[PDB]
Design a protein around this ligand. Structure first.
Ligand SMILES: [Ca+2]
Lengths: 223, 32
């Protein structure tokens, strides 16, 4: 997260870290057994880390649960990034409490202009690479599809939206992929891609979760 | 995504056939 702020320990209790020896992506806990992330975050042997604040220090609220299944959307396209969504089933159910809690799925899509909370342990620099220890947060509005398509001609599908600031300076970045974009208490986006981070006229692009609510429900049922 | 690299060939696993570069120690092919 570039241009954000320290969230505060466990203030985003649905935020998880995906770890394959190191933190590489975020995710969002949607019930005690399932996490939403990005399809491009798929790897074999993912360990989900819940209840994290400082990802480098054991603080006493962590649950480390390996993925038993990582169900990528069957129509994910790694070239266009369309359908960039994945469901991770935990090998065992997480214990829910004040610091580890699920986030509600949307019942309807969000609208341009709505403010959302984006969070993660990704790079905090628009130039160079940093690795924050504690979770970072950013308030950012959903941008018009017109400005999104102007920023990314030929690349924006119906399953994507832009959010952030065309002026630059505030964005998600490498290491934030798969994490939440929460708007009015609903998980409306997944950190997906952008041209660099926090660059002028290159806002972050996010998977549009509201188009996948049915798929999420059927995948939970199938597994 | 965060994937460290020394050359872009190290990014093949996460970047697949996408064009990009290994820069500032990490894979850069737009995905976060
Ligand atoms: Ca920790």
């Amino acid at each position: 997260i570039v241009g954000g702020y320290t969230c505060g320990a466990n203030t985003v209790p649905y935020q998880v870290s995906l770890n394959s020896g190191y933190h590489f992506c975020g995710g969002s806990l949607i019930n005690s057994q399932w996490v939403v992330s990005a399809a491009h975050c798929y790897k074999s042997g993912i360990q989900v880390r819940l209840g994290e604040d400082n990802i480098n220090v054991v603080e006493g609220n962590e649950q480390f649960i390996s993925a038993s299944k990582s169900i990528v959307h069957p129509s994910y396209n790694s070239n266009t990034l369309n359908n960039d969504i994945m469901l991770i089933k935990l090998k065992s159910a997480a214990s829910l409490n004040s610091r580890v809690a699920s986030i509600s799925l949307p019942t309807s899509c969000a609208s341009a202009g709505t403010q959302c909370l984006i969070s993660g342990w990704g790079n905090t620099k628009s130039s160079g690479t940093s690795y924050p220890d504690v979770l970072k947060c950013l308030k950012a509005p959903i941008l018009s599809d017109s400005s999104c398509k102007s920023a990314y001609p030929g690349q924006i599908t119906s399953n994507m939206f832009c959010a952030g600031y065309l002026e630059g300076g505030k964005d998600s970045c490498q290491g934030d992929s798969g994490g939440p974009v929460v708007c009015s208490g609903k998980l409306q986006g997944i950190v997906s891609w952008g041209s660099g981070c926090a660059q002028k006229n290159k806002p972050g692009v996010y998977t549009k979760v509201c188009n996948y609510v049915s798929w999420i429900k059927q995948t939970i049922a199938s597994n | 995504i965060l994937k460290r690299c020394k050359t872009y060939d190290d990014c093949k696993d996460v970047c697949k056939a996408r064009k990009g570069k290994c820069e500032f120690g990490i894979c850069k092919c737009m995905i976060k």
